[PDB]
């Protein structure tokens, strides 16, 4: 059940403006290429509008480089002291679009190194200093309880999904995951929020760390078994249920995706729209993975219902 | 790939009864429900019923109630399928699907 | 019971051409769990089922994406955009909503000459 390439053309979006509304606009042509990447539509939704997409994605490259400051960390404005979640954001977007364009290493692990020997705490803890003007952009992190536990859970997904470039560039780096790692797994199980029990799972599953009681946790948090949602913005659970279900193929719990994945199919959730960012980059992330790693796989039988009359 | 083996061709007298088994592989045998459809020679399909090899749970076409038994043996990853009262129209190939077909078991009533 | 009527019955068909079949049920196969439980196989000669569609437009695995599915309420379209030589055989589609579950009289798709 591929989302249609028709349903997605509103994602590919000339990114403009200061350093958050460029990453705003850049977050929804690179997951829609990445996406109809991986579920082969190109042929089909049109060969010749991929180079104009990867276009589009390398000016939101280069506009990105105009925020980099001197420590290679991220804000709106370059006279703007650095937010740590911006700078993890650049990274988690520029990791993923390594396959697109040409990201250079200097900038990636730059800002990587940054947010380890900057604001890192001696507990593991990633600090913002300088949260962005558009706080609409990071999605359920704007929710005020778990901020310790969601924002490390964040810059640890970041990190993890640039190490495979970085970590032969930045010696800090496998270090910084433990301790990150240790944080999470040792605070788990006092999560409230389906959000944070979500990012943080995902961020622990990438290291082997979902397990046993967290895990459990991790599972029976989901409602019906096929989200992940607090009574609020619907587009924190869309979120919520995309980094769940990137753990769970981490955890190669295949037989638990397929309800997830028509849950978030049900929502037709197409992004675009105000204080989109996340829910856009995170359910596009989250469906290719599971194209790649376990397309329609089937958990039962499903020529038929699972009544039983027995008359 | 999964397949689903079933035993060979049957030859039974009107009144007689037959029995056909179904050996999985390749999937968790307890997640997949377990039709039995038979064809008649040249003819089209009938459902004859369903088992949840999970809870052991039947249910049957209401036309063989009394005379069809489904069971599996989980450790084996088998479904049984037993008719009795065997009748000439029951001269058909019987196969399971959960949901990937067997290669279906051939039962001709005759005398 | 549901009754699974099938259109044509038989569909001589050109390698490289397309070929549309229908199937109508005289009755919603809108499941109250929510799914619609429409079923496609083919049948070639001596043979088991080889299971395409599910859930009226899901494409079995390593089911060519030339096989698509369509419809919704009663009816019910398969589709192959291009005809390919192992295409031939009977195609059913049949219905897992109501008891007893029912099946179509099937559809030849054979080669044109």
């Known amino acids: 059940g591929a989302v249609d390439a028709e349903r997605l053309k509103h994602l590919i979006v000339t990114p403009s403006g200061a350093g958050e509304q460029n990453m705003i606009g850049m977050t929804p042509t690179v997951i829609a290429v990445h996406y109809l990447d991986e579920t082969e539509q190109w042929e089909k939704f049109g060969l010749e509008k991929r180079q104009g997409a990867l276009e589009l994605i390398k000016k939101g490259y280069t506009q990105q480089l105009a925020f980099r400051q001197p420590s290679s960390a991220f804000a709106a404005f370059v006279k703007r002291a650095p937010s740590t979640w911006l700078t993890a954001y650049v990274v988690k977007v520029f990791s993923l679009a390594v396959n697109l364009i040409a990201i250079d290493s200097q900038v990636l692990c730059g800002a990587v190194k940054w947010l380890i020997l900057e604001k890192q705490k001696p507990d593991g803890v990633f600090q913002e200093d300088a949260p962005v003007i558009h706080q609409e952009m990071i999605g359920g992190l704007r929710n005020n309880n778990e901020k310790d536990m969601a924002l490390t859970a964040f810059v640890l997904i970041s990190l993890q999904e640039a190490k495979d470039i970085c970590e032969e560039q930045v010696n800090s780096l496998p270090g910084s995951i433990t301790k990150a790692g240790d944080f999470l797994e040792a605070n788990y199980m006092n999560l409230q929020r389906s959000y944070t029990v979500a990012i943080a799972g995902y961020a622990l599953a990438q290291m082997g760390r979902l397990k046993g009681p967290l895990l459990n946790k991790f599972l029976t948090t989901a409602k019906d078994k096929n989200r992940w949602e607090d009574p609020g913005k619907q587009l924190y659970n869309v979120e919520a249920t995309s980094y769940a279900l990137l753990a769970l193929l981490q955890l190669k719990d295949f037989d638990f995706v397929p309800p997830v994945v028509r849950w978030l199919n049900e929502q037709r959730y197409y992004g675009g729209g105000y204080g989109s960012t996340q829910a856009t980059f995170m359910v596009f992330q989250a469906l290719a993975q599971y194209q790649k790693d376990a397309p329609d796989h089937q958990e039962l039988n499903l020529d038929v219902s699972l009544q039983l009359p027995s008359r | 790939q999964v397949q689903l083996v079933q035993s060979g061709a049957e030859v039974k007298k009107p009144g007689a009864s037959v029995k056909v088994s179904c050996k999985a592989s390749?999937?968790?045998?307890?997640?997949?429900?377990i039709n039995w459809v038979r064809q008649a020679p040249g003819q089209g399909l009938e459902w004859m019923g369903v088992?949840?090899?999970?809870?052991?749970?039947?249910s049957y076409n209401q036309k063989f109630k009394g005379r069809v038994t489904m069971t599996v043996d989980t450790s084996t990853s088998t479904a049984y399928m037993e008719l009795s009262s065997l009748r000439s129209e029951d001269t058909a190939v019987y196969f399971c699907?959960?949901?990937?077909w067997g290669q279906g078991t051939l039962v001709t009533v005759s005398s | 019971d549901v009754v699974m009527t099938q259109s044509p019955l038989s569909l001589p068909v050109t390698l490289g051409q397309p070929a549309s079949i229908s199937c109508k049920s005289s009755?919603?196969?809108?499941?109250?769990?929510?799914?619609?439980?429409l079923n496609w196989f083919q049948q070639r000669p001596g043979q088991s089922p080889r299971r395409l569609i599910y859930?009226?437009?899901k494409l079995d695995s390593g089911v060519p994406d030339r096989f698509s599915g369509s419809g919704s309420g009663t009816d019910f379209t398969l589709k192959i955009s291009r005809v390919e030589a192992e295409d031939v055989g009977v195609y059913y589609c049949?219905?897992?909503?109501?008891?007893?579950?029912?099946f179509g009289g099937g559809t030849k798709v054979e080669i044109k000459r």
């Open positions: 088992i949840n090899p999970y809870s052991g749970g039947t």
């Open positions: 859930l009226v437009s």
């Open positions: 390749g999937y968790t045998f307890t997640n997949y429900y």
């Open positions: 049949w219905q897992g909503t109501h008891f007893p579950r029912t």
């Open positions: 009755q919603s196969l809108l499941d109250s769990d929510g799914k619609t439980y």
């Open positions: 699907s959960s949901p990937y």
